[PDB]
Design an enzyme around this catalytic site. Sequence first.
Site, PDB file in Angstrom:
ATOM      1  N   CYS A  63      -4.930  -7.895  -7.501  1.00 33.13           N
ATOM      2  CA  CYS A  63      -4.588  -7.506  -8.861  1.00 33.13           C
ATOM      3  C   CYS A  63      -3.077  -7.339  -8.880  1.00 33.13           C
ATOM      4  O   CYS A  63      -2.533  -6.568  -8.087  1.00 33.13           O
ATOM      5  CB  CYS A  63      -5.257  -6.175  -9.226  1.00 33.13           C
TER       6      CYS A  63
ATOM      7  N   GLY B  97      -2.611   4.073   3.759  1.00 34.02           N
ATOM      8  CA  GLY B  97      -3.622   3.035   3.758  1.00 34.02           C
ATOM      9  C   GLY B  97      -3.284   1.906   4.719  1.00 34.02           C
ATOM     10  O   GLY B  97      -4.128   1.489   5.521  1.00 34.02           O
TER      11      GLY B  97
ATOM     12  N   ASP C 199      -9.496  11.142  -7.564  1.00 30.41           N
ATOM     13  CA  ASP C 199      -8.134  10.775  -7.208  1.00 30.41           C
ATOM     14  C   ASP C 199      -7.537   9.933  -8.318  1.00 30.41           C
ATOM     15  O   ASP C 199      -6.859   8.925  -8.081  1.00 30.41           O
ATOM     16  CB  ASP C 199      -8.092  10.035  -5.867  1.00 30.41           C
TER      17      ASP C 199
ATOM     18  N   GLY D 215       0.793  -1.223   0.000  1.00 33.13           N
ATOM     19  CA  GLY D 215       0.000   0.000   0.000  1.00 33.13           C
ATOM     20  C   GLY D 215       0.823   1.270   0.000  1.00 33.13           C
ATOM     21  O   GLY D 215       0.530   2.224   0.733  1.00 33.13           O
TER      22      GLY D 215
ATOM     23  N   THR E  21       3.241   4.928   1.575  1.00 35.91           N
ATOM     24  CA  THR E  21       3.165   4.745   3.026  1.00 35.91           C
ATOM     25  C   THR E  21       1.756   5.019   3.559  1.00 35.91           C
ATOM     26  O   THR E  21       1.575   5.268   4.749  1.00 35.91           O
ATOM     27  CB  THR E  21       4.232   5.592   3.779  1.00 35.91           C
TER      28      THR E  21
HETATM   29  O1  LIG Z   1      -4.217   2.962  -0.744  1.00 38.84           O
HETATM   30  C1  LIG Z   1      -4.077   3.254  -2.142  1.00 38.84           C
HETATM   31  C2  LIG Z   1      -2.907   2.465  -2.714  1.00 38.84           C
HETATM   32  O2  LIG Z   1      -2.994   1.106  -2.273  1.00 38.84           O
HETATM   33  C3  LIG Z   1      -3.092   0.199  -3.373  1.00 38.84           C
HETATM   34  N1  LIG Z   1      -4.454  -0.380  -3.367  1.00 38.84           N
HETATM   35  C4  LIG Z   1      -5.539   0.208  -2.848  1.00 38.84           C
HETATM   36  N2  LIG Z   1      -6.608  -0.601  -3.015  1.00 38.84           N
HETATM   37  C5  LIG Z   1      -6.184  -1.707  -3.648  1.00 38.84           C
HETATM   38  C6  LIG Z   1      -6.847  -2.844  -4.070  1.00 38.84           C
HETATM   39  C7  LIG Z   1      -6.126  -3.836  -4.712  1.00 38.84           C
HETATM   40 CL1  LIG Z   1      -6.957  -5.317  -5.263  1.00 38.84          CL
HETATM   41  C8  LIG Z   1      -4.765  -3.704  -4.937  1.00 38.84           C
HETATM   42 CL2  LIG Z   1      -3.862  -5.012  -5.775  1.00 38.84          CL
HETATM   43  C9  LIG Z   1      -4.102  -2.559  -4.514  1.00 38.84           C
HETATM   44  C10 LIG Z   1      -4.819  -1.560  -3.869  1.00 38.84           C
HETATM   45  C11 LIG Z   1      -2.898   0.988  -4.657  1.00 38.84           C
HETATM   46  O3  LIG Z   1      -1.664   0.592  -5.280  1.00 38.84           O
HETATM   47  C12 LIG Z   1      -2.915   2.455  -4.239  1.00 38.84           C
HETATM   48  O4  LIG Z   1      -1.794   3.185  -4.747  1.00 38.84           O
END
Ligand SMILES: OC[C@H]1O[C@@H](n2cnc3cc(Cl)c(Cl)cc32)[C@H](O)[C@@H]1O
Lengths: 252, 315
Positions: free
Chosen positions: B94, B26, B137, B21, B24
């Site tokens: 993903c 989330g 965003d 994530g 830094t």
């Molecule tokens: O908190 C936002 C950042 O965390 C990653 N992220 C957020 N939701 C996500 C859901 C999935 Cl399935 C993935 Cl693989 C990455 C995610 C993304 O890469 C994003 O840049």
Amino acid sequence: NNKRWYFTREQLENSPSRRFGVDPDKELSYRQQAANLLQDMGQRLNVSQLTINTAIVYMHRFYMIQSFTRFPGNSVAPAALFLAAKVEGQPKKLEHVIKVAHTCLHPQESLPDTRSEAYLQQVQDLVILESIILQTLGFELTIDHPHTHVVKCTQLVRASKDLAQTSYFMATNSLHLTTFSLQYTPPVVACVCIHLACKWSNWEIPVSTDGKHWWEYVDATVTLELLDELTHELLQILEKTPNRLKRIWNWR
Amino acid sequence: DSVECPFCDEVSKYEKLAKIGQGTFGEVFKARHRKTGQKVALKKVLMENEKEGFPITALREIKILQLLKHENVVNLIEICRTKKGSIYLVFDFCEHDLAGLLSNVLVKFTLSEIKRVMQMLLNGLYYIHRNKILHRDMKAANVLITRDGVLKLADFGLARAFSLAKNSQPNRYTNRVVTLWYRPPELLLGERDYGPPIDLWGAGCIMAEMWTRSPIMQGNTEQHQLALISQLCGSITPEVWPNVDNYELYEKLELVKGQKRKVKDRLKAYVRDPYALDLIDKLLVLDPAQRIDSDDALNHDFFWSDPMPSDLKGM
Ligand SMILES: OC[C@H]1O[C@@H](n2cnc3cc(Cl)c(Cl)cc32)[C@H](O)[C@@H]1O
């Protein structure tokens, strides 16, 4: 799926509360109480009937999973309203909801000292319960708001202003007084409320130009036989509720 | 003792693997279901201070993810608890994101692949906007792609719903939204009655980032940015952008007066296809209500010329 928060008569019979000593009749009033407390707090906190309704549904659904013997409605309702208000765009501050809950439930006692540990813990308690409500609902907080359904069915029968006001009233009271919203879809409930409203107002809805009854335009699954049973149950509860029917009673 | 909880599983059913994530923010983990090996993303709900109970902006995000179900939008599977207590949002995993691929020089896109990427991205914008949601965003980092080459827009942590603004009362939405580089002029000029167009602009900055491999307008602050934009699109004027004057910050921000539209030109060197250029152009339009929409963008000749959009396997 979309049958998770809908229940059978038998399921309603065997509620969590039933399995703990609580009669059908007692439980039903427990909900009615909590719904009152919701309405009272919501009015004082100045939130919409929509928000209050959402809370009442959170409350109903909650008690299909939890029992009144473990979670008293007086504790759950403030938490449920606190949640409903954020969810619906009308956040009320946590202190504020606690102040109002307190006056409602102890019109005499004086609010503790925010500095107190007594108070600080009732703040933690509400927040905890909001958490348990969230979990219990499986984090599914988007409710199909029932008023708008009623509005469209009154429009769909060119109802009087009065006939719609009465409908809206049935509508709102069904949420406080029956568990209809745990048994029938918002579209159907609204038919129920419009049917009963017609009967009360001695208004006859003309059959279609075809022969189709008005409700078929709203929910295919709705049979007169059903409306009659539901409007009967609703009306019985209304007749039991002091001063309520007075509000829609023609006096001239 | 314990409380019944039929509809919220404990996150321990997943096995954490690695923080992914980045920025830094989330606190996002890749994880594996302990029974089926199915991979997922766990986004823990921040809770830093949060003195008002469960965070309202998280409820918002969870509402929006639940409403958005579509092949080009990330997919919330469930929400999980811990047993202080924590809450995790669980997504279908993903493998790639578009920032990772655009920076990595071992990776290359045929014109047609790019075309597909844009097609999927625009298609997903069509879907969310139709459902009355703004992403707010847009940035390559938030654009993921699966093993099987399916693009998905993600991170709706800033997303919000929007309304048809009539009854003679313009909306008051939060202004400081969207990363600086992928932020559109409307917002810099302090607009609060904005709409779907703010995402389309993002989508532009991303179209070009598909050839330039690099965010095309990097700015230090809102003032450096807004100039840098005008140093690509032309000067902001009522002539080019009707009623742009009415923004308090227009003349009240020393906007560079002398600038003519140098967008196709400054980009020809990177993107050759004249159709791609034209689309990038209609997306990077200054005036929101003159900027191209997802529908029209999709019917643009770009997506209906040789080479045709191809599936993705070059990754
Ligand atoms: O908190 C936002 C950042 O965390 C990653 N992220 C957020 N939701 C996500 C859901 C999935 Cl399935 C993935 Cl693989 C990455 C995610 C993304 O890469 C994003 O840049």
